[PDB]
PDB file of N, CA and C in Angstrom:
ATOM      1  N   UNK A   1     101.660 105.610  86.598  1.00 45.05           N
ATOM      2  CA  UNK A   1     102.794 106.723  86.331  1.00 45.05           C
ATOM      3  C   UNK A   1     104.155 106.180  86.607  1.00 45.05           C
ATOM      4  N   UNK A   2     105.090 106.777  85.907  1.00 44.63           N
ATOM      5  CA  UNK A   2     106.475 106.419  85.837  1.00 44.63           C
ATOM      6  C   UNK A   2     106.734 105.019  85.187  1.00 44.63           C
ATOM      7  N   UNK A   3     107.458 104.947  84.107  1.00 45.06           N
ATOM      8  CA  UNK A   3     107.647 103.513  83.267  1.00 45.06           C
ATOM      9  C   UNK A   3     108.537 102.660  84.255  1.00 45.06           C
ATOM     10  N   UNK A   4     107.987 101.391  84.276  1.00 42.48           N
ATOM     11  CA  UNK A   4     108.427 100.266  85.133  1.00 42.48           C
ATOM     12  C   UNK A   4     109.094  99.193  84.419  1.00 42.48           C
ATOM     13  N   UNK A   5     110.253  98.460  84.923  1.00 43.63           N
ATOM     14  CA  UNK A   5     110.872  97.346  84.256  1.00 43.63           C
ATOM     15  C   UNK A   5     110.113  96.116  84.132  1.00 43.63           C
ATOM     16  N   UNK A   6     109.199  95.988  85.113  1.00 45.85           N
ATOM     17  CA  UNK A   6     108.241  94.783  85.213  1.00 45.85           C
ATOM     18  C   UNK A   6     106.884  95.318  85.521  1.00 45.85           C
ATOM     19  N   UNK A   7     105.769  94.413  85.045  1.00 48.67           N
ATOM     20  CA  UNK A   7     104.531  94.720  85.443  1.00 48.67           C
ATOM     21  C   UNK A   7     104.067  94.274  86.780  1.00 48.67           C
ATOM     22  N   UNK A   8     103.138  94.849  87.459  1.00 46.48           N
ATOM     23  CA  UNK A   8     102.591  94.192  88.652  1.00 46.48           C
ATOM     24  C   UNK A   8     101.139  94.527  88.859  1.00 46.48           C
ATOM     25  N   UNK A   9     100.535  93.666  89.855  1.00 43.21           N
ATOM     26  CA  UNK A   9      98.997  93.738  89.835  1.00 43.21           C
ATOM     27  C   UNK A   9      98.644  93.954  91.287  1.00 43.21           C
ATOM     28  N   UNK A  10      97.998  94.905  91.748  1.00 45.79           N
ATOM     29  CA  UNK A  10      97.598  95.015  93.223  1.00 45.79           C
ATOM     30  C   UNK A  10      95.954  95.297  93.036  1.00 45.79           C
ATOM     31  N   UNK A  11      95.385  95.153  94.208  1.00 45.54           N
ATOM     32  CA  UNK A  11      93.996  95.159  94.350  1.00 45.54           C
ATOM     33  C   UNK A  11      93.599  95.715  95.742  1.00 45.54           C
ATOM     34  N   UNK A  12      92.323  96.223  96.158  1.00 45.85           N
ATOM     35  CA  UNK A  12      92.113  97.169  97.120  1.00 45.85           C
ATOM     36  C   UNK A  12      92.580  96.916  98.704  1.00 45.85           C
ATOM     37  N   UNK A  13      92.520  95.682  99.093  1.00 43.88           N
ATOM     38  CA  UNK A  13      92.894  95.297 100.349  1.00 43.88           C
ATOM     39  C   UNK A  13      94.425  95.350 100.568  1.00 43.88           C
ATOM     40  N   UNK A  14      95.250  94.952  99.585  1.00 45.15           N
ATOM     41  CA  UNK A  14      96.527  95.163  99.592  1.00 45.15           C
ATOM     42  C   UNK A  14      97.115  96.494  99.736  1.00 45.15           C
ATOM     43  N   UNK A  15      96.488  97.459  99.073  1.00 44.65           N
ATOM     44  CA  UNK A  15      96.808  98.869  99.021  1.00 44.65           C
ATOM     45  C   UNK A  15      96.752  99.497 100.331  1.00 44.65           C
ATOM     46  N   UNK A  16      95.724  99.392 101.077  1.00 42.82           N
ATOM     47  CA  UNK A  16      95.498  99.934 102.513  1.00 42.82           C
ATOM     48  C   UNK A  16      96.428  99.334 103.529  1.00 42.82           C
ATOM     49  N   UNK A  17      96.778  97.976 103.551  1.00 45.77           N
ATOM     50  CA  UNK A  17      97.700  97.390 104.437  1.00 45.77           C
ATOM     51  C   UNK A  17      99.115  97.939 104.067  1.00 45.77           C
ATOM     52  N   UNK A  18      99.416  97.886 102.698  1.00 45.58           N
ATOM     53  CA  UNK A  18     100.702  98.444 102.176  1.00 45.58           C
ATOM     54  C   UNK A  18     101.020  99.849 102.427  1.00 45.58           C
ATOM     55  N   UNK A  19      99.912 100.812 102.670  1.00 42.34           N
ATOM     56  CA  UNK A  19      99.997 102.224 102.685  1.00 42.34           C
ATOM     57  C   UNK A  19     100.789 102.627 103.857  1.00 42.34           C
ATOM     58  N   UNK A  20     100.621 102.043 105.126  1.00 43.99           N
ATOM     59  CA  UNK A  20     101.292 102.286 106.235  1.00 43.99           C
ATOM     60  C   UNK A  20     102.832 101.784 106.178  1.00 43.99           C
ATOM     61  N   UNK A  21     103.023 100.754 105.571  1.00 47.12           N
ATOM     62  CA  UNK A  21     104.238 100.081 105.623  1.00 47.12           C
ATOM     63  C   UNK A  21     105.291 100.460 104.444  1.00 47.12           C
ATOM     64  N   UNK A  22     104.658 101.468 103.488  1.00 45.01           N
ATOM     65  CA  UNK A  22     105.440 101.948 102.451  1.00 45.01           C
ATOM     66  C   UNK A  22     106.608 102.971 102.514  1.00 45.01           C
ATOM     67  N   UNK A  23     106.550 103.525 103.745  1.00 43.44           N
ATOM     68  CA  UNK A  23     107.682 104.637 104.021  1.00 43.44           C
ATOM     69  C   UNK A  23     107.032 105.958 103.920  1.00 43.44           C
ATOM     70  N   UNK A  24     106.033 106.060 103.266  1.00 42.12           N
ATOM     71  CA  UNK A  24     105.244 107.432 103.373  1.00 42.12           C
ATOM     72  C   UNK A  24     104.697 107.574 104.865  1.00 42.12           C
ATOM     73  N   UNK A  25     104.325 108.714 105.421  1.00 42.89           N
ATOM     74  CA  UNK A  25     103.843 108.869 106.602  1.00 42.89           C
ATOM     75  C   UNK A  25     102.410 108.538 106.797  1.00 42.89           C
ATOM     76  N   UNK A  26     102.030 107.788 107.849  1.00 46.72           N
ATOM     77  CA  UNK A  26     100.882 107.131 108.054  1.00 46.72           C
ATOM     78  C   UNK A  26      99.692 108.014 108.518  1.00 46.72           C
ATOM     79  N   UNK A  27      99.379 109.322 107.737  1.00 46.07           N
ATOM     80  CA  UNK A  27      98.529 110.180 107.926  1.00 46.07           C
ATOM     81  C   UNK A  27      96.971 109.898 107.606  1.00 46.07           C
ATOM     82  N   UNK A  28      96.857 109.052 106.497  1.00 45.78           N
ATOM     83  CA  UNK A  28      95.503 108.824 106.104  1.00 45.78           C
ATOM     84  C   UNK A  28      94.897 107.563 106.730  1.00 45.78           C
ATOM     85  N   UNK A  29      95.780 106.493 106.894  1.00 42.39           N
ATOM     86  CA  UNK A  29      95.403 105.262 107.525  1.00 42.39           C
ATOM     87  C   UNK A  29      96.495 105.138 108.765  1.00 42.39           C
ATOM     88  N   UNK A  30      96.117 104.953 109.958  1.00 39.85           N
ATOM     89  CA  UNK A  30      96.908 104.576 111.099  1.00 39.85           C
ATOM     90  C   UNK A  30      96.544 103.338 111.801  1.00 39.85           C
ATOM     91  N   UNK A  31      97.387 102.803 112.577  1.00 38.12           N
ATOM     92  CA  UNK A  31      97.163 101.533 113.453  1.00 38.12           C
ATOM     93  C   UNK A  31      96.416 101.979 114.691  1.00 38.12           C
ATOM     94  N   UNK A  32      95.159 101.185 115.063  1.00 34.82           N
ATOM     95  CA  UNK A  32      94.727 101.377 116.212  1.00 34.82           C
ATOM     96  C   UNK A  32      95.386 100.527 117.310  1.00 34.82           C
ATOM     97  N   UNK A  33      95.658  99.177 116.893  1.00 31.86           N
ATOM     98  CA  UNK A  33      95.923  98.177 117.767  1.00 31.86           C
ATOM     99  C   UNK A  33      96.982  97.246 117.160  1.00 31.86           C
ATOM    100  N   UNK A  34      98.127  97.089 117.571  1.00 31.35           N
ATOM    101  CA  UNK A  34      99.176  96.300 116.921  1.00 31.35           C
ATOM    102  C   UNK A  34      98.830  94.757 116.953  1.00 31.35           C
ATOM    103  N   UNK A  35      98.445  94.182 118.072  1.00 31.53           N
ATOM    104  CA  UNK A  35      98.020  92.836 118.254  1.00 31.53           C
ATOM    105  C   UNK A  35      96.759  92.401 117.572  1.00 31.53           C
ATOM    106  N   UNK A  36      95.699  93.234 117.705  1.00 32.05           N
ATOM    107  CA  UNK A  36      94.491  93.034 117.219  1.00 32.05           C
ATOM    108  C   UNK A  36      94.419  93.115 115.714  1.00 32.05           C
ATOM    109  N   UNK A  37      95.113  94.107 115.150  1.00 27.51           N
ATOM    110  CA  UNK A  37      95.249  94.395 113.607  1.00 27.51           C
ATOM    111  C   UNK A  37      94.144  95.328 113.172  1.00 27.51           C
ATOM    112  N   UNK A  38      93.535  96.012 114.130  1.00 25.70           N
ATOM    113  CA  UNK A  38      92.645  97.069 113.875  1.00 25.70           C
ATOM    114  C   UNK A  38      93.412  98.321 113.277  1.00 25.70           C
ATOM    115  N   UNK A  39      92.859  98.898 112.240  1.00 25.06           N
ATOM    116  CA  UNK A  39      93.398  99.951 111.632  1.00 25.06           C
ATOM    117  C   UNK A  39      92.334 101.070 111.594  1.00 25.06           C
ATOM    118  N   UNK A  40      92.603 102.358 111.833  1.00 22.42           N
ATOM    119  CA  UNK A  40      91.687 103.363 111.752  1.00 22.42           C
ATOM    120  C   UNK A  40      91.770 104.198 110.522  1.00 22.42           C
ATOM    121  N   UNK A  41      90.776 104.530 109.703  1.00 22.41           N
ATOM    122  CA  UNK A  41      90.798 105.537 108.601  1.00 22.41           C
ATOM    123  C   UNK A  41      90.674 106.884 109.292  1.00 22.41           C
ATOM    124  N   UNK A  42      91.530 107.919 108.655  1.00 24.00           N
ATOM    125  CA  UNK A  42      91.304 109.316 109.108  1.00 24.00           C
ATOM    126  C   UNK A  42      90.077 109.849 108.373  1.00 24.00           C
ATOM    127  N   UNK A  43      89.292 110.692 109.163  1.00 25.08           N
ATOM    128  CA  UNK A  43      87.900 111.034 108.614  1.00 25.08           C
ATOM    129  C   UNK A  43      88.057 112.091 107.536  1.00 25.08           C
ATOM    130  N   UNK A  44      88.977 113.080 107.848  1.00 23.64           N
ATOM    131  CA  UNK A  44      89.237 114.269 106.901  1.00 23.64           C
ATOM    132  C   UNK A  44      89.939 113.827 105.572  1.00 23.64           C
ATOM    133  N   UNK A  45      90.776 112.650 105.528  1.00 24.05           N
ATOM    134  CA  UNK A  45      91.587 112.242 104.513  1.00 24.05           C
ATOM    135  C   UNK A  45      90.897 111.197 103.631  1.00 24.05           C
ATOM    136  N   UNK A  46      89.670 110.849 103.922  1.00 25.74           N
ATOM    137  CA  UNK A  46      88.934 109.726 103.252  1.00 25.74           C
ATOM    138  C   UNK A  46      88.907 109.973 101.657  1.00 25.74           C
ATOM    139  N   UNK A  47      88.267 111.122 101.347  1.00 25.95           N
ATOM    140  CA  UNK A  47      88.222 111.692 100.018  1.00 25.95           C
ATOM    141  C   UNK A  47      89.568 111.769  99.274  1.00 25.95           C
ATOM    142  N   UNK A  48      90.557 112.390 100.013  1.00 25.43           N
ATOM    143  CA  UNK A  48      91.861 112.533  99.438  1.00 25.43           C
ATOM    144  C   UNK A  48      92.730 111.276  99.202  1.00 25.43           C
ATOM    145  N   UNK A  49      92.492 110.270  99.949  1.00 24.33           N
ATOM    146  CA  UNK A  49      93.113 108.822  99.893  1.00 24.33           C
ATOM    147  C   UNK A  49      92.519 108.213  98.641  1.00 24.33           C
ATOM    148  N   UNK A  50      91.209 108.317  98.610  1.00 22.47           N
ATOM    149  CA  UNK A  50      90.420 107.688  97.313  1.00 22.47           C
ATOM    150  C   UNK A  50      90.717 108.432  96.068  1.00 22.47           C
ATOM    151  N   UNK A  51      90.848 109.939  96.041  1.00 22.18           N
ATOM    152  CA  UNK A  51      91.227 110.633  95.104  1.00 22.18           C
ATOM    153  C   UNK A  51      92.570 110.396  94.513  1.00 22.18           C
ATOM    154  N   UNK A  52      93.590 110.164  95.423  1.00 20.16           N
ATOM    155  CA  UNK A  52      94.921 109.909  95.136  1.00 20.16           C
ATOM    156  C   UNK A  52      95.073 108.557  94.252  1.00 20.16           C
ATOM    157  N   UNK A  53      94.299 107.467  94.744  1.00 19.30           N
ATOM    158  CA  UNK A  53      94.120 106.170  93.930  1.00 19.30           C
ATOM    159  C   UNK A  53      93.551 106.303  92.601  1.00 19.30           C
ATOM    160  N   UNK A  54      92.318 107.177  92.647  1.00 19.99           N
ATOM    161  CA  UNK A  54      91.535 107.364  91.567  1.00 19.99           C
ATOM    162  C   UNK A  54      92.342 108.091  90.313  1.00 19.99           C
ATOM    163  N   UNK A  55      92.997 109.161  90.703  1.00 22.48           N
ATOM    164  CA  UNK A  55      94.010 109.770  89.785  1.00 22.48           C
ATOM    165  C   UNK A  55      95.273 108.875  89.548  1.00 22.48           C
ATOM    166  N   UNK A  56      95.696 108.025  90.459  1.00 22.80           N
ATOM    167  CA  UNK A  56      96.681 106.992  90.189  1.00 22.80           C
ATOM    168  C   UNK A  56      96.150 106.005  89.014  1.00 22.80           C
ATOM    169  N   UNK A  57      95.074 105.558  89.087  1.00 21.13           N
ATOM    170  CA  UNK A  57      94.293 104.779  88.069  1.00 21.13           C
ATOM    171  C   UNK A  57      94.099 105.466  86.907  1.00 21.13           C
ATOM    172  N   UNK A  58      93.601 106.864  86.867  1.00 21.38           N
ATOM    173  CA  UNK A  58      93.624 107.542  85.736  1.00 21.38           C
ATOM    174  C   UNK A  58      92.603 108.746  85.611  1.00 21.38           C
ATOM    175  N   UNK A  59      92.713 109.360  84.578  1.00 20.24           N
ATOM    176  CA  UNK A  59      91.659 110.751  84.348  1.00 20.24           C
ATOM    177  C   UNK A  59      90.262 110.292  84.321  1.00 20.24           C
ATOM    178  N   UNK A  60      89.922 109.181  83.395  1.00 21.46           N
ATOM    179  CA  UNK A  60      88.510 108.944  82.953  1.00 21.46           C
ATOM    180  C   UNK A  60      87.648 108.477  84.124  1.00 21.46           C
ATOM    181  N   UNK A  61      88.003 107.674  85.107  1.00 22.51           N
ATOM    182  CA  UNK A  61      87.097 107.079  86.014  1.00 22.51           C
ATOM    183  C   UNK A  61      87.359 107.600  87.497  1.00 22.51           C
ATOM    184  N   UNK A  62      86.266 108.127  88.146  1.00 21.18           N
ATOM    185  CA  UNK A  62      86.551 108.670  89.509  1.00 21.18           C
ATOM    186  C   UNK A  62      86.522 107.470  90.482  1.00 21.18           C
ATOM    187  N   UNK A  63      87.187 107.688  91.740  1.00 20.02           N
ATOM    188  CA  UNK A  63      87.079 106.784  92.670  1.00 20.02           C
ATOM    189  C   UNK A  63      86.967 107.522  94.040  1.00 20.02           C
ATOM    190  N   UNK A  64      86.068 107.224  94.883  1.00 20.95           N
ATOM    191  CA  UNK A  64      85.490 107.993  95.936  1.00 20.95           C
ATOM    192  C   UNK A  64      85.247 107.114  97.273  1.00 20.95           C
ATOM    193  N   UNK A  65      85.059 107.703  98.363  1.00 20.14           N
ATOM    194  CA  UNK A  65      84.931 106.891  99.551  1.00 20.14           C
ATOM    195  C   UNK A  65      83.788 105.905  99.661  1.00 20.14           C
ATOM    196  N   UNK A  66      82.644 106.234  99.028  1.00 16.95           N
ATOM    197  CA  UNK A  66      81.458 105.188  98.899  1.00 16.95           C
ATOM    198  C   UNK A  66      81.924 104.031  98.115  1.00 16.95           C
ATOM    199  N   UNK A  67      82.637 104.407  96.919  1.00 16.92           N
ATOM    200  CA  UNK A  67      82.711 103.424  95.902  1.00 16.92           C
ATOM    201  C   UNK A  67      83.762 102.402  96.405  1.00 16.92           C
ATOM    202  N   UNK A  68      84.859 102.890  97.068  1.00 16.53           N
ATOM    203  CA  UNK A  68      85.819 102.119  97.884  1.00 16.53           C
ATOM    204  C   UNK A  68      85.223 101.331  99.003  1.00 16.53           C
ATOM    205  N   UNK A  69      84.270 101.982  99.823  1.00 16.62           N
ATOM    206  CA  UNK A  69      83.670 101.267 100.896  1.00 16.62           C
ATOM    207  C   UNK A  69      82.610 100.110 100.563  1.00 16.62           C
ATOM    208  N   UNK A  70      81.880 100.208  99.456  1.00 16.42           N
ATOM    209  CA  UNK A  70      81.249  99.195  98.834  1.00 16.42           C
ATOM    210  C   UNK A  70      82.041  97.979  98.394  1.00 16.42           C
ATOM    211  N   UNK A  71      83.201  98.240  97.701  1.00 19.60           N
ATOM    212  CA  UNK A  71      84.165  97.198  97.590  1.00 19.60           C
ATOM    213  C   UNK A  71      84.935  96.564  98.766  1.00 19.60           C
ATOM    214  N   UNK A  72      85.369  97.520  99.587  1.00 18.22           N
ATOM    215  CA  UNK A  72      86.139  97.237 100.853  1.00 18.22           C
ATOM    216  C   UNK A  72      85.278  96.357 101.759  1.00 18.22           C
ATOM    217  N   UNK A  73      83.995  96.583 102.098  1.00 22.87           N
ATOM    218  CA  UNK A  73      83.087  95.970 102.854  1.00 22.87           C
ATOM    219  C   UNK A  73      82.839  94.380 102.235  1.00 22.87           C
ATOM    220  N   UNK A  74      82.808  94.261 100.791  1.00 24.51           N
ATOM    221  CA  UNK A  74      82.729  92.902 100.210  1.00 24.51           C
ATOM    222  C   UNK A  74      83.656  91.915 100.526  1.00 24.51           C
ATOM    223  N   UNK A  75      84.843  92.346 100.963  1.00 22.81           N
ATOM    224  CA  UNK A  75      85.894  91.462 101.430  1.00 22.81           C
ATOM    225  C   UNK A  75      85.488  90.592 102.657  1.00 22.81           C
ATOM    226  N   UNK A  76      84.535  91.199 103.593  1.00 26.03           N
ATOM    227  CA  UNK A  76      83.987  90.681 104.844  1.00 26.03           C
ATOM    228  C   UNK A  76      83.545  89.275 104.809  1.00 26.03           C
ATOM    229  N   UNK A  77      82.785  88.901 103.825  1.00 25.57           N
ATOM    230  CA  UNK A  77      82.120  87.600 103.716  1.00 25.57           C
ATOM    231  C   UNK A  77      83.204  86.605 103.564  1.00 25.57           C
ATOM    232  N   UNK A  78      84.492  86.805 102.877  1.00 27.26           N
ATOM    233  CA  UNK A  78      85.613  86.096 102.739  1.00 27.26           C
ATOM    234  C   UNK A  78      86.350  86.093 103.961  1.00 27.26           C
ATOM    235  N   UNK A  79      86.558  87.267 104.483  1.00 25.43           N
ATOM    236  CA  UNK A  79      87.063  87.379 105.964  1.00 25.43           C
ATOM    237  C   UNK A  79      88.410  87.879 106.066  1.00 25.43           C
ATOM    238  N   UNK A  80      89.183  88.294 104.836  1.00 26.47           N
ATOM    239  CA  UNK A  80      90.511  88.767 104.627  1.00 26.47           C
ATOM    240  C   UNK A  80      90.618  90.082 105.409  1.00 26.47           C
ATOM    241  N   UNK A  81      89.522  90.897 105.320  1.00 31.97           N
ATOM    242  CA  UNK A  81      89.483  92.230 105.921  1.00 31.97           C
ATOM    243  C   UNK A  81      88.022  92.292 106.513  1.00 31.97           C
ATOM    244  N   UNK A  82      88.001  92.543 107.938  1.00 30.66           N
ATOM    245  CA  UNK A  82      86.655  92.404 108.617  1.00 30.66           C
ATOM    246  C   UNK A  82      86.342  93.891 109.325  1.00 30.66           C
ATOM    247  N   UNK A  83      85.059  94.385 109.044  1.00 30.40           N
ATOM    248  CA  UNK A  83      84.514  95.593 109.589  1.00 30.40           C
ATOM    249  C   UNK A  83      84.317  95.433 111.070  1.00 30.40           C
ATOM    250  N   UNK A  84      84.219  96.594 111.758  1.00 33.40           N
ATOM    251  CA  UNK A  84      84.052  96.821 113.003  1.00 33.40           C
ATOM    252  C   UNK A  84      82.785  97.720 113.158  1.00 33.40           C
ATOM    253  N   UNK A  85      82.246  97.680 114.392  1.00 32.06           N
ATOM    254  CA  UNK A  85      81.020  98.645 114.529  1.00 32.06           C
ATOM    255  C   UNK A  85      81.269 100.141 114.376  1.00 32.06           C
ATOM    256  N   UNK A  86      82.448 100.556 114.519  1.00 31.25           N
ATOM    257  CA  UNK A  86      82.985 101.886 113.961  1.00 31.25           C
ATOM    258  C   UNK A  86      83.228 101.770 112.635  1.00 31.25           C
ATOM    259  N   UNK A  87      82.630 102.384 111.582  1.00 31.32           N
ATOM    260  CA  UNK A  87      82.634 102.175 110.222  1.00 31.32           C
ATOM    261  C   UNK A  87      84.046 102.388 109.480  1.00 31.32           C
ATOM    262  N   UNK A  88      84.918 103.391 110.196  1.00 31.97           N
ATOM    263  CA  UNK A  88      86.193 103.767 109.687  1.00 31.97           C
ATOM    264  C   UNK A  88      87.322 102.849 110.313  1.00 31.97           C
ATOM    265  N   UNK A  89      86.831 101.852 111.007  1.00 28.67           N
ATOM    266  CA  UNK A  89      87.726 100.880 111.630  1.00 28.67           C
ATOM    267  C   UNK A  89      87.702  99.595 111.065  1.00 28.67           C
ATOM    268  N   UNK A  90      88.741  98.797 110.401  1.00 28.71           N
ATOM    269  CA  UNK A  90      88.748  97.517 109.876  1.00 28.71           C
ATOM    270  C   UNK A  90      89.743  96.806 110.665  1.00 28.71           C
ATOM    271  N   UNK A  91      89.604  95.309 110.776  1.00 29.14           N
ATOM    272  CA  UNK A  91      90.987  94.566 111.248  1.00 29.14           C
ATOM    273  C   UNK A  91      91.093  93.542 110.120  1.00 29.14           C
ATOM    274  N   UNK A  92      92.395  93.238 109.981  1.00 29.44           N
ATOM    275  CA  UNK A  92      93.010  92.558 108.959  1.00 29.44           C
ATOM    276  C   UNK A  92      93.338  91.143 109.454  1.00 29.44           C
ATOM    277  N   UNK A  93      93.331  90.104 108.611  1.00 27.33           N
ATOM    278  CA  UNK A  93      93.396  88.708 108.905  1.00 27.33           C
ATOM    279  C   UNK A  93      94.875  88.408 108.837  1.00 27.33           C
ATOM    280  N   UNK A  94      95.317  87.117 109.363  1.00 30.39           N
ATOM    281  CA  UNK A  94      96.736  86.755 109.645  1.00 30.39           C
ATOM    282  C   UNK A  94      97.571  86.641 108.307  1.00 30.39           C
ATOM    283  N   UNK A  95      96.857  86.209 107.183  1.00 31.00           N
ATOM    284  CA  UNK A  95      97.514  85.976 105.927  1.00 31.00           C
ATOM    285  C   UNK A  95      97.876  87.354 105.246  1.00 31.00           C
ATOM    286  N   UNK A  96      97.001  88.257 105.232  1.00 31.10           N
ATOM    287  CA  UNK A  96      97.179  89.720 104.777  1.00 31.10           C
ATOM    288  C   UNK A  96      98.296  90.511 105.552  1.00 31.10           C
ATOM    289  N   UNK A  97      98.289  90.262 106.813  1.00 29.88           N
ATOM    290  CA  UNK A  97      99.321  90.878 107.695  1.00 29.88           C
ATOM    291  C   UNK A  97     100.622  90.276 107.459  1.00 29.88           C
ATOM    292  N   UNK A  98     100.613  88.869 107.474  1.00 28.07           N
ATOM    293  CA  UNK A  98     101.857  88.090 107.191  1.00 28.07           C
ATOM    294  C   UNK A  98     102.500  88.341 105.940  1.00 28.07           C
ATOM    295  N   UNK A  99     101.727  88.190 104.858  1.00 29.13           N
ATOM    296  CA  UNK A  99     102.428  88.274 103.521  1.00 29.13           C
ATOM    297  C   UNK A  99     101.831  89.337 102.901  1.00 29.13           C
ATOM    298  N   UNK A 100     102.597  89.946 102.025  1.00 29.16           N
ATOM    299  CA  UNK A 100     102.299  91.177 101.124  1.00 29.16           C
ATOM    300  C   UNK A 100     103.035  90.885  99.745  1.00 29.16           C
ATOM    301  N   UNK A 101     102.495  91.384  98.715  1.00 30.05           N
ATOM    302  CA  UNK A 101     103.043  91.321  97.419  1.00 30.05           C
ATOM    303  C   UNK A 101     101.887  91.452  96.446  1.00 30.05           C
ATOM    304  N   UNK A 102     102.214  90.574  95.135  1.00 28.50           N
ATOM    305  CA  UNK A 102     101.365  90.539  94.042  1.00 28.50           C
ATOM    306  C   UNK A 102     100.829  89.086  93.677  1.00 28.50           C
ATOM    307  N   UNK A 103      99.653  88.981  93.139  1.00 27.22           N
ATOM    308  CA  UNK A 103      99.183  87.699  92.633  1.00 27.22           C
ATOM    309  C   UNK A 103      98.304  87.922  91.540  1.00 27.22           C
ATOM    310  N   UNK A 104      97.973  86.977  90.667  1.00 31.34           N
ATOM    311  CA  UNK A 104      96.895  87.146  89.697  1.00 31.34           C
ATOM    312  C   UNK A 104      95.795  86.044  89.956  1.00 31.34           C
ATOM    313  N   UNK A 105      94.663  86.331  90.147  1.00 33.37           N
ATOM    314  CA  UNK A 105      93.453  85.570  90.248  1.00 33.37           C
ATOM    315  C   UNK A 105      92.321  86.218  89.682  1.00 33.37           C
ATOM    316  N   UNK A 106      91.319  85.436  89.038  1.00 35.66           N
ATOM    317  CA  UNK A 106      90.078  85.856  88.477  1.00 35.66           C
ATOM    318  C   UNK A 106      89.023  86.255  89.564  1.00 35.66           C
ATOM    319  N   UNK A 107      88.127  87.274  89.302  1.00 38.43           N
ATOM    320  CA  UNK A 107      87.095  87.553  90.286  1.00 38.43           C
ATOM    321  C   UNK A 107      85.906  88.059  89.385  1.00 38.43           C
ATOM    322  N   UNK A 108      84.747  88.095  89.917  1.00 40.35           N
ATOM    323  CA  UNK A 108      83.577  88.721  89.114  1.00 40.35           C
ATOM    324  C   UNK A 108      83.581  90.173  89.294  1.00 40.35           C
ATOM    325  N   UNK A 109      83.081  91.025  88.499  1.00 39.09           N
ATOM    326  CA  UNK A 109      82.888  92.496  88.752  1.00 39.09           C
ATOM    327  C   UNK A 109      81.997  92.711  89.951  1.00 39.09           C
ATOM    328  N   UNK A 110      82.195  93.880  90.706  1.00 40.36           N
ATOM    329  CA  UNK A 110      81.473  94.195  91.863  1.00 40.36           C
ATOM    330  C   UNK A 110      79.870  94.329  91.658  1.00 40.36           C
TER     331      UNK A 110
END
């Protein structure tokens, strides 16, 4: 939405870290712990956050909490975003906390 001067690529882990730092109010995702880098997802707003991204992507395809969770969990083996024993809590690695932006790299479908 809204025509842009240049094209950009983002993907799921980038969006949730960017969400807080965007200048929008941190209602859907908030910080647990500034040094640990645990972030807490708000229980009420899980569908709304996923729906906003889904309608940002387009009319045709839905995106929902499960669909996001299956994709989000899959980062854990690489270790960029790590799960906690509380499902709605993840913590983020040094590289993702340190640097934010855009990149293009190939990946298989989920």
